[PDB]
């Protein structure tokens, strides 16, 4: 076990998934800022199987899960793993494929009905139209499992059309549209407060 590093600490029943855009729309430096944001967020959550569980997935044309909700590791080790996520700089970053992964590989088997489910979709690009056929269906599938999707649009290449579609699916699906990764730290606490408020108290 490890104590909180800050006074601001979400201590509720929540399963939170960080989905990171691995496309080259973000430079290696910007991706580091994105990871720093993820780490900063994690520090403000009571990470534990009995409180806030976390998952981290980097998506390109396919995806790489670095941390799974059930991974029983020290919060500090989980944060270290997140800080070490490798920069992909891929030509394509499919939001449809990563939402499919979230729906069928993260929240397929609900081992924790007592926790709220949230997917923080950090987007900086637009996937090829040929990969979006089931986009709306996966978002609706998530909605039906009460998996709240919070899209964070970063920069002008972010898929704003999909962000808007996501917001439309469920009231809790709130979007955060930022001009760049440098604005993430500015809105971090607001984002944490929003999602923590969504989760049940123990």
Short mmCIF file of C-alpha atoms in Angstrom, two decimals:
data_model
loop_
_atom_site.label_atom_id
_atom_site.label_comp_id
_atom_site.label_asym_id
_atom_site.label_seq_id
_atom_site.Cartn_x
_atom_site.Cartn_y
_atom_site.Cartn_z
CA UNK A 1 0.00 0.00 0.00
CA UNK A 2 1.01 3.63 -0.52
CA UNK A 3 -0.35 6.89 0.93
CA UNK A 4 -1.71 9.78 -1.17
CA UNK A 5 0.82 12.26 -2.54
CA UNK A 6 -1.74 15.08 -2.61
CA UNK A 7 -4.71 16.51 -0.71
CA UNK A 8 -6.76 16.31 -3.93
CA UNK A 9 -7.50 12.57 -3.95
CA UNK A 10 -10.47 10.71 -5.50
CA UNK A 11 -11.46 7.96 -3.10
CA UNK A 12 -14.50 6.42 -4.77
CA UNK A 13 -15.42 3.18 -6.55
CA UNK A 14 -14.26 3.67 -10.11
CA UNK A 15 -12.68 1.80 -13.02
CA UNK A 16 -10.91 4.41 -15.16
CA UNK A 17 -9.39 3.71 -18.57
CA UNK A 18 -6.80 6.01 -20.17
CA UNK A 19 -6.74 5.63 -23.98
CA UNK A 20 -3.73 7.36 -25.57
CA UNK A 21 -3.51 8.46 -29.21
CA UNK A 22 -0.32 6.90 -30.56
CA UNK A 23 -0.36 8.68 -33.92
CA UNK A 24 2.31 11.02 -35.24
CA UNK A 25 -0.12 13.94 -34.92
CA UNK A 26 1.59 14.25 -31.56
CA UNK A 27 5.38 14.62 -31.58
CA UNK A 28 7.51 12.57 -29.20
CA UNK A 29 7.70 15.64 -26.93
CA UNK A 30 3.95 16.22 -26.96
CA UNK A 31 3.37 12.54 -26.18
CA UNK A 32 5.58 12.94 -23.11
CA UNK A 33 3.36 15.82 -21.99
CA UNK A 34 0.33 13.57 -22.57
CA UNK A 35 1.86 10.82 -20.44
CA UNK A 36 2.75 13.35 -17.74
CA UNK A 37 -0.94 14.30 -17.67
CA UNK A 38 -1.92 10.65 -17.24
CA UNK A 39 0.61 10.26 -14.40
CA UNK A 40 -0.58 13.51 -12.78
CA UNK A 41 -4.15 12.20 -12.92
CA UNK A 42 -3.20 8.84 -11.42
CA UNK A 43 -1.53 10.56 -8.46
CA UNK A 44 -4.90 12.12 -7.66
CA UNK A 45 -6.78 8.82 -7.50
CA UNK A 46 -6.76 6.25 -4.71
CA UNK A 47 -5.50 3.41 -6.90
CA UNK A 48 -6.55 0.02 -5.57
CA UNK A 49 -8.75 -2.94 -6.48
CA UNK A 50 -11.15 -1.72 -3.78
CA UNK A 51 -11.17 1.93 -4.85
CA UNK A 52 -10.00 3.35 -8.18
CA UNK A 53 -8.68 0.85 -10.69
CA UNK A 54 -6.77 2.05 -13.73
CA UNK A 55 -5.98 0.83 -17.22
CA UNK A 56 -3.67 2.34 -19.84
CA UNK A 57 -3.81 1.59 -23.55
CA UNK A 58 -1.89 3.26 -26.38
CA UNK A 59 -3.71 3.05 -29.70
CA UNK A 60 -2.52 3.11 -33.31
CA UNK A 61 -3.71 0.73 -36.04
CA UNK A 62 -4.38 -1.76 -33.28
CA UNK A 63 -3.58 -1.21 -29.60
CA UNK A 64 -1.15 -1.98 -26.79
CA UNK A 65 -2.47 -2.37 -23.24
CA UNK A 66 0.24 -1.47 -20.70
CA UNK A 67 -1.95 -1.68 -17.62
CA UNK A 68 -5.12 -3.68 -17.02
CA UNK A 69 -7.72 -2.86 -14.37
CA UNK A 70 -6.93 -6.09 -12.49
CA UNK A 71 -3.16 -5.55 -12.37
CA UNK A 72 -2.30 -5.75 -8.67
CA UNK A 73 0.73 -3.47 -8.59
CA UNK A 74 1.80 -0.56 -6.38
CA UNK A 75 0.28 2.78 -7.50
CA UNK A 76 3.83 4.10 -7.98
CA UNK A 77 4.74 1.17 -10.23
CA UNK A 78 1.59 1.67 -12.28
CA UNK A 79 2.49 5.35 -12.65
CA UNK A 80 6.01 4.36 -13.69
CA UNK A 81 4.63 1.99 -16.31
CA UNK A 82 2.43 4.80 -17.63
CA UNK A 83 5.38 7.20 -17.74
CA UNK A 84 7.31 4.63 -19.78
CA UNK A 85 4.68 3.98 -22.47
CA UNK A 86 6.59 3.94 -25.77
CA UNK A 87 5.99 6.66 -28.36
CA UNK A 88 4.50 5.06 -31.48
CA UNK A 89 4.13 7.97 -33.87
CA UNK A 90 1.93 5.80 -36.08
CA UNK A 91 0.39 6.91 -39.37
CA UNK A 92 -2.98 5.73 -38.08
CA UNK A 93 -4.64 5.80 -34.65
CA UNK A 94 -8.02 4.06 -34.74
CA UNK A 95 -10.56 5.28 -32.19
CA UNK A 96 -13.03 2.68 -33.45
CA UNK A 97 -10.62 -0.15 -32.72
CA UNK A 98 -9.70 1.14 -29.27
CA UNK A 99 -13.36 1.61 -28.28
CA UNK A 100 -13.96 -1.94 -29.51
CA UNK A 101 -11.11 -3.07 -27.24
CA UNK A 102 -12.61 -1.17 -24.31
CA UNK A 103 -16.05 -2.67 -24.93
CA UNK A 104 -15.01 -6.28 -25.54
CA UNK A 105 -11.72 -6.62 -23.66
CA UNK A 106 -11.85 -4.25 -20.69
CA UNK A 107 -15.53 -4.11 -19.76
CA UNK A 108 -16.61 -7.44 -21.23
CA UNK A 109 -16.50 -9.35 -17.95
CA UNK A 110 -17.87 -7.10 -15.22
CA UNK A 111 -16.02 -8.33 -12.14
CA UNK A 112 -16.88 -5.09 -10.38
CA UNK A 113 -20.56 -4.11 -10.64
CA UNK A 114 -20.12 -1.71 -7.70
CA UNK A 115 -17.86 0.69 -9.63
CA UNK A 116 -18.63 3.32 -12.23
CA UNK A 117 -16.86 2.84 -15.56
CA UNK A 118 -15.10 5.63 -17.41
CA UNK A 119 -12.99 5.76 -20.55
CA UNK A 120 -10.86 8.87 -21.04
CA UNK A 121 -10.29 9.02 -24.81
CA UNK A 122 -7.31 11.30 -25.47
CA UNK A 123 -7.56 12.09 -29.18
CA UNK A 124 -5.23 14.07 -31.44
CA UNK A 125 -6.13 12.62 -34.84
CA UNK A 126 -8.74 11.30 -37.29
CA UNK A 127 -8.78 7.65 -38.34
CA UNK A 128 -9.27 6.68 -42.00
CA UNK A 129 -13.00 6.62 -42.80
CA UNK A 130 -12.64 2.98 -43.87
CA UNK A 131 -12.11 2.06 -40.20
CA UNK A 132 -15.17 3.84 -38.80
CA UNK A 133 -18.03 1.59 -39.95
CA UNK A 134 -18.86 0.35 -36.44
CA UNK A 135 -17.84 3.49 -34.51
CA UNK A 136 -21.37 4.48 -33.50
CA UNK A 137 -22.18 0.89 -32.62
CA UNK A 138 -19.20 0.54 -30.26
CA UNK A 139 -20.02 3.84 -28.57
CA UNK A 140 -23.61 2.70 -28.11
CA UNK A 141 -22.37 -0.66 -26.84
CA UNK A 142 -20.35 1.15 -24.19
CA UNK A 143 -23.32 3.35 -23.31
CA UNK A 144 -25.44 0.24 -22.76
CA UNK A 145 -22.89 -1.05 -20.25
CA UNK A 146 -22.87 2.34 -18.50
CA UNK A 147 -19.30 2.93 -19.61
CA UNK A 148 -19.02 6.71 -19.68
CA UNK A 149 -16.80 7.96 -22.50
CA UNK A 150 -15.03 11.27 -21.95
CA UNK A 151 -13.38 12.44 -25.19
CA UNK A 152 -10.54 14.93 -24.84
CA UNK A 153 -9.82 16.51 -28.21
CA UNK A 154 -6.25 17.74 -28.53
CA UNK A 155 -5.28 19.99 -31.42
CA UNK A 156 -6.85 20.65 -34.85
CA UNK A 157 -6.32 17.13 -36.21
CA UNK A 158 -8.55 15.64 -33.50
CA UNK A 159 -11.69 13.93 -34.82
CA UNK A 160 -14.23 16.54 -33.70
CA UNK A 161 -17.05 14.81 -35.58
CA UNK A 162 -16.57 11.65 -33.50
CA UNK A 163 -16.19 13.69 -30.33
CA UNK A 164 -19.60 15.23 -31.01
CA UNK A 165 -21.14 11.81 -31.73
CA UNK A 166 -19.81 10.52 -28.42
CA UNK A 167 -21.29 13.44 -26.46
CA UNK A 168 -24.67 12.79 -28.09
CA UNK A 169 -24.88 9.16 -26.94
CA UNK A 170 -25.17 9.79 -23.19
CA UNK A 171 -25.52 12.86 -20.93
CA UNK A 172 -22.46 11.91 -18.86
CA UNK A 173 -20.32 11.66 -22.01
CA UNK A 174 -18.72 15.10 -21.64
CA UNK A 175 -16.14 16.42 -24.09
CA UNK A 176 -13.07 18.53 -23.32
CA UNK A 177 -11.69 20.28 -26.41
CA UNK A 178 -8.15 21.60 -25.99
CA UNK A 179 -5.84 23.48 -28.36
CA UNK A 180 -2.80 21.39 -27.41
CA UNK A 181 -1.28 19.02 -24.85
CA UNK A 182 0.04 22.09 -23.00
CA UNK A 183 -3.50 22.86 -21.85
CA UNK A 184 -3.99 19.45 -20.21
CA UNK A 185 -2.39 20.45 -16.89
CA UNK A 186 -4.69 23.49 -16.84
CA UNK A 187 -7.83 21.34 -17.02
CA UNK A 188 -6.59 18.28 -15.13
CA UNK A 189 -8.26 18.92 -11.78
CA UNK A 190 -11.53 19.90 -13.44
CA UNK A 191 -11.48 16.62 -15.36
CA UNK A 192 -10.67 14.59 -12.22
CA UNK A 193 -13.45 16.33 -10.27
CA UNK A 194 -15.97 15.64 -13.04
CA UNK A 195 -15.30 11.92 -13.29
CA UNK A 196 -14.86 11.38 -9.55
CA UNK A 197 -18.27 13.00 -8.99
CA UNK A 198 -19.72 10.40 -11.36
CA UNK A 199 -18.56 7.46 -9.25
CA UNK A 200 -20.30 5.97 -6.18
CA UNK A 201 -18.93 6.60 -2.69
CA UNK A 202 -17.83 3.51 -0.77
#
